[PDB]
Design a protein around this ligand. Structure first.
Ligand SMILES: O=C([C@@H]1CCCN1C(=O)CCn1c(=O)c(-c2ccccc2)nc2ccccc21)N1CCCC1
Length: 709
């Protein structure tokens, strides 16, 4: 290390008692983001990382090459609202993609909403939008500097006229227009004392559901639902297809379960004037209920009640008893039913997950019968468009070496032959030169975990190639095939191997796959992931010295632990906006919501699981002498209100102090706190290119790999 680590004050009086257990958190002052102490800390760390990163001549190689390979047309699915068609498009290197509008699939598209002119650095992103039933009015949310907070503004679709309406203090909101098109449903939070730009760590409780009449001030919005008894509950709302019913999904935590109330708008004496006459249909968190469509009083939902892999059921609001429910499409024994859409009045589009791959089939609404099976190569379905009134669908398909293909299908045709609408090609990369392979490796307990492997055709397995292993594991999130130029460059001009392990904790094999990697079995996640590395090492794909593991958010927690538990298995480690303090993660912003996957330190029983793997409280110098901690780069941003950066700070301070101080430790323990960025969504192209070029530079310079022109 040509640089020396900063002097961080250790508050040895900061001791807490956790059910008889006393834990010392000396860097607990970093929890205050506005302090002079913290500010001087972040700066101090950035003072030694930037150079380190910018000193390696491979960064500019990467950065420049990324800019070229990443310079390709990126479109989204076409979707029709009212009588117009819409689609997001990005000429290539635009910071934020733009929303286009055309009065006809053959008409001439025209800019509708360019968020690019709202910020010189593209740090103002669109976060959620909702057209009106007539497609004549449009409301969208904007986020500044990757912050979760949102401001909802409105626009008149014809002439793109901007309206005065504006809604503030919005977060994790729904946007449901009533069909009389007079107002929209949305959620807001109470006025809390202090900042509210995404730099605060304050808790978010008491979310309410309001109603905004178009043309009025938010001071007048109507309060339609609140659970003053249950601070952590979050009620989201949507309107049934026929627009006669307001369906309310009440949630608590990030579990695939929700309560479902409802309100017959025709039973409201004077429209919407306040708390609605809710009918508690499902008053429990036993299962999830995802509204698909409804014919009269028979509502069809995607549920996982007694169906770990999900299924379709029908409820008649007039015959509510669970007993009377009917099963439309039985749960599958192996395939997970991801999402469902109703198009052309009586067609249902079921999107299944088959061994981590996506399959699309058309079923009959009335019977559930399978009608057509849309042919798909290996990869995922990243976009879809088709509502109950539409007579055609669109779906974008992506893969590891496929930038994306947008298909189109006219449902008003005897022969349901789907055609290719748009096919984006990325010149400079020859898909025919790389090969994808899906293997199932056994974990510590004998469970088989799937893994995707992408490498050059013909590489000899001598354990000489750099390897990039990615995993998340948790919150029912499925890690499916996706395009990543930045990753392919790794394989191209760095000769490495890419690997994605669909370890437990995810929803690849239904909830039973989620529950086998959460709460008391969270260790399973780590073991699954560790075994993944062992596999690449054994099969000679790579080596502990040249293997890099990556992970963001709950995924960063994964790699952080995997280093604390087996630092001899990895050579490099890059944790992105990760959760490190498993003891008090629930005290900040939206962290309480995750207790359903990790547990809560406030509970004696939960503490025993958490204290065993909590990254912050488990850093330890290897006992061996020929073993040290893998070079690690932590990445976070000051506006990340999702996983407050206090997690990365207190963790870098500890890594540098406990380990960084030893003499046997040569590998750098660094951290990078980006400005004007948040958890990740809405990150402008510019910053994305800066970021990736930083990770692979770190990896290059850290493992000493050469560039391959
Ligand atoms: O980021 C996370 C976790 C896991 C998945 C998303 N997540 C979050 O907690 C996502 C936050 N979140 C939302 O954003 C919305 C929402 C719905 C509609 C529109 C806008 C928002 N609804 C939620 C309902 C319950 C709990 C959390 C919710 N983590 C980081 C660390 C591990 C958990």
């Amino acid at each position: 290390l040509s640089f020396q680590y900063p002097d961080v004050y250790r508050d040895e009086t900061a001791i807490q008692d956790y059910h008889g257990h006393k834990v010392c958190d000396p860097y607990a002052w970093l929890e205050d983001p506005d302090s002079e102490q913290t500010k001087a800390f972040v700066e101090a760390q950035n003072k030694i990382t930037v150079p380190f990163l910018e000193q390696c001549p491979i960064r500019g190689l990467y950065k420049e090459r990324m800019t070229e390979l990443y310079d390709y047309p990126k479109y989204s699915c076409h979707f029709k609202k009212g009588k117009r068609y819409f689609y997001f498009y990005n000429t290539g290197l635009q910071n934020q993609r733009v929303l286009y509008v055309q009065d006809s699939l053959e008409g001439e598209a025209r800019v509708f909403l360019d968020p690019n002119i709202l910020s010189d650095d593209g740090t103002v992103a669109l976060r959620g939008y909702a057209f009106s039933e007539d497609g004549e009015y449009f409301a969208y949310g904007l986020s500044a500097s990757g912050s979760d907070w949102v401001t909802i503004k409105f626009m008149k679709v014809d002439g793109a006229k901007e309206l005065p309406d504006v809604l503030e203090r919005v977060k994790f909101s729904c946007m449901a227009w009533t069909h009389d098109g007079k107002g929209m449903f949305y959620n807001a939070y109470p006025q809390q004392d202090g900042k509210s730009d995404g730099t605060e760590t304050s808790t978010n409780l008491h979310q309410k559901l309001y109603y905004h009449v178009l043309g009025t001030d938010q001071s007048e919005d109507i309060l339609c639902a609140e659970f003053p008894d249950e601070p952590k509950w979050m009620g989201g709302a949507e309107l049934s297809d026929d627009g006669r019913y307001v369906l309310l999904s009440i949630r608590e935590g990030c579990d695939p379960v929700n309560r479902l109330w409802y309100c017959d708008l025709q039973q409201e004496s004077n429209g919407i004037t306040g708390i609605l006459k809710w009918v508690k249909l499902i008053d429990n968190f036993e299962g999830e209920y995802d509204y698909v469509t409804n014919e009269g009083t028979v509502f069809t939902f995607k549920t996982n009640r007694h169906s770990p892999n999900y299924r379709l059921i029908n409820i008649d609001f007039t015959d509510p008893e669970e007993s009377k429910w009917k099963v439309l499409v039985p749960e599958h024994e192996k395939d997970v039913l991801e999402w469902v859409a109703c198009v052309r009045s009586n067609f249902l589009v079921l999107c299944y997950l088959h061994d981590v791959k996506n399959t699309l089939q058309l079923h009959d609404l009335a019977t559930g019968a399978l009608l057509k099976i849309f042919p798909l190569e290996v990869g995922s379905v990243v976009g879809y468009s088709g509502q109950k009134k539409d007579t055609e669908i669109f779906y974008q398909f992506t893969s590891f070496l496929s930038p994306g293909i947008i298909y189109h299908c006219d449902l008003t045709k005897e022969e349901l032959e789907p055609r290719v609408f748009r096919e984006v090609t990325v010149k400079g990369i020859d898909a025919s030169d790389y090969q994808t392979v899906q293997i199932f490796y056994p974990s510590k307990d004998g469970t088989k975990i799937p893994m995707f492997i992408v490498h050059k055709k013909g590489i000899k397995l001598d354990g000489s190639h750099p390897a990039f292993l990615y995993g998340y594991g948790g919150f029912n999130i499925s890690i499916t095939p996706n395009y990543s130029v930045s990753r392919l460059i790794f394989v191209r001009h760095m000769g490495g191997v890419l690997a994605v392990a669909n370890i437990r904790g995810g929803g690849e094999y239904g909830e039973t796959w989620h529950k086998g990697g959460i709460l008391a079995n969270k260790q399973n996640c780590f073991d699954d992931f560790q075994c993944a590395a062992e596999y690449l090492i054994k099969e000679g794909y790579t080596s502990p010295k040249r293997l890099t593991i990556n992970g963001g958010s709950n995924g960063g927690l994964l790699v952080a632990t995997c280093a604390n538990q087996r630092p001899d298995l990895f050579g490099c480690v890059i944790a992105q906006v990760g959760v490190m303090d498993m003891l008090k993660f629930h005290k900040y912003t939206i962290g309480h919501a995750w207790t359903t996957d990790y547990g809560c330190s406030d509970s004696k029983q939960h503490f025993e699981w958490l204290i065993k793997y909590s990254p912050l409280h488990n850093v330890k110098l290897p006992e061996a002498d020929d073993i040290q901690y893998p070079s690690m780069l932590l990445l976070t941003a000051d506006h990340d209100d999702r996983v407050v950066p206090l997690h990365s700070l207190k963790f870098i301070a500890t890594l540098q102090y406990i380990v960084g101080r030893s003499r046997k430790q040569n590998n750098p323990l660094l951290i990078h706190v980006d400005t004007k960025a948040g958890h990740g969504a809405g990150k402008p192209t510019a910053k994305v290119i800066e970021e990736v070029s930083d990770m692979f530079a770190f990896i290059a310079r850290c493992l000493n790999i050469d560039w391959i022109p």
